[PDB]
Amino acid sequence: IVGGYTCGANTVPYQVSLNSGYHFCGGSLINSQWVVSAAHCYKSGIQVRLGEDNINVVEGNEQFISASKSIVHPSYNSNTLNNDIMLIKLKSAASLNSRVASISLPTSCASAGTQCLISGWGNTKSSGTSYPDVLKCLKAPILSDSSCKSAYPGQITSNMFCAGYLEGGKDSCQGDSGGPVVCSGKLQGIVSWGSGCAQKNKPGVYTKVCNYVSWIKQTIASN
């Protein structure tokens, strides 16, 4: 997260870290057994780390649980990044507590101008690299379709939205992928892609979760 702030320990209790010997993506817990992330975060041997604040120090209340299944959307496309959503099943149920809790799925889509909370352990620099120990947070508005399509000609589908600031300086960045965008207490977005990070007139692009609610429910039920 570029231009964000320290969330505060466990203030985003649905936020998880995906780990394969290093943190590589985020995710959001949606029930005790299932995490929503981005399909481009897919790989074998994912360990889900729940209840984290500082990902580089073990305090003892973290839960490290392997993914037993990682299911990309069947229409995911790695070129266009359309349908960039993935469901991870945990090998064992997470134990829910003050630091580990699920985020509600939306019942309706969000609209331009709505302020959302975006979080992650991603790069905090727009040029060069710096990775934080503790979880970072960013408040950002959903932008109009017009703003989004002007920024990303030919690249925006009905399954994406832009969020952020056209002046630059505030954005999600590498390491944030798969993490939450939460608007009025609902998971409306997944960190997906952009042209760099925090660049002028290049806001972050996010998977539009409200389009996938039925698919999520059916996939959870079937697996």
Binding site: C25, Q174, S177, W193, G194, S195
Partner: peptide, 14 residues
């Protein structure tokens, strides 16, 4: 350029 926000980043069409 067009990149996913994973570590490491993956390219997108752009």
């Amino acid at each position: 350029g067009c990149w996913t926000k994973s570590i490491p980043p993956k390219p997108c069409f752009g």
